[PDB]
């Protein structure tokens, strides 16, 4: 059965692009300077590595309920 986090992920809406003003205290937004120069701001989303690393200990659940068994069967001899 899907984890609560995966349920949320499946039902969540995509942010429309890079957003600056939605994060809680202590969380940095993506660097706005990387995105200042982008023309297609609804299509091309530049995220600095520091921003992306914030998620590492935050979204840790499997991307599908059977993911571990699926990978094992895909790879195993």
């Amino acid at each position: 059965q899907p984890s609560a986090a995966l349920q949320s992920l499946r039902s969540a809406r995509f942010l429309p692009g890079i957003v600056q003003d939605i994060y809680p205290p202590g969380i940095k937004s993506p660097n706005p300077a990387l995105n200042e120069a982008v023309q297609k701001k609804g299509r091309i989303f530049k995220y600095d590595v520091q921003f992306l690393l914030q998620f590492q200990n935050v979204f840790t659940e499997k991307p599908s309920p059977d993911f571990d068994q699926q990978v094992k069967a895909l790879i195993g001899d």
Binding site: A4, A5, L6, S8, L9, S11, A12, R13, F14, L15, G17, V19, I22, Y23, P24, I27, L34, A37, V38, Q39, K40, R43, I44, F45, K46, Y47, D48, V49, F51, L52, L53, Q54, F55, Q56, V58, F59, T60, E61, K62, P63, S64, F67, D68, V71, L74, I75, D77
Partner: protein
């Protein structure tokens, strides 16, 4: 208000962070010990579209340092198989760096940062249209990390090489090298 990110509630959130395209993680396994599979080693693992999905994948797969020799990970834009014969790779090439020692290198972090530079779109500029995928190879004597490009043409390609060198934290003496995939492509030194 209207937006709950994973940082607001990691179990019940309602927005996610898009990537600029869909990406697919692939894995090449070692030839089977059973002796009956040396030619069907490339596996498609999963396609994803968000930062959150990337981390759910990364946090639930083996790091590079846990792979058997003669394994690879490949992270390629959706629709591009990580093989030179794919029509989108056939006339292209790669920037690559070989880590001559497997033990003196935080290879997991270097590969993670390479993938994050790829999906975060900090390897190339908008409409450069060059990055097709990134790859890490585990071999007996070395690791290799590379960025596969669509063409072998040029300032756009050189800057990609320099950005990879930066992501890999390499000192100036260590050179990242560009090469075409095919002999003809390479026949027709590019280092940073």
């Amino acid at each position: 208000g209207p937006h709950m990110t994973v940082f607001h509630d990691k179990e019940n959130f309602n927005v996610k962070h898009p990537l600029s395209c869909r990406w697919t993680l692939w894995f090449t396994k070692p030839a089977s010990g059973k002796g009956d599979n040396w030619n069907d080693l490339l596996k498609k693992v999963i396609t994803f579209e968000s930062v959150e999905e990337f981390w759910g994948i990364y946090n639930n797969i083996a790091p590079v340092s846990e792979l058997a020799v003669k394994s690879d990970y490949h992270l390629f834009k959706e629709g591009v198989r990580p093989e030179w014969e794919d029509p989108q790779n056939k006339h292209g090439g790669k920037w690559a760096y070989q880590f001559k020692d497997k033990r003196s290198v935080n290879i997991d972090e270097l590969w993670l940062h390479t993938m994050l530079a790829a999906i975060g779109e900090t390897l190339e500029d908008e409409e450069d249209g060059e990055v097709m995928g990134v790859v890490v190879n585990v071999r007996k004597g070395f690791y290799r990390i590379g960025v596969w490009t669509r063409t072998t043409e040029k300032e756009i390609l050189m800057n990609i090489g320099r950005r990879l060198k930066e992501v890999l934290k390499l000192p100036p003496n260590e050179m990242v090298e560009f090469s075409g995939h095919t002999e003809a492509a390479q026949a027709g030194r590019m280092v940073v």
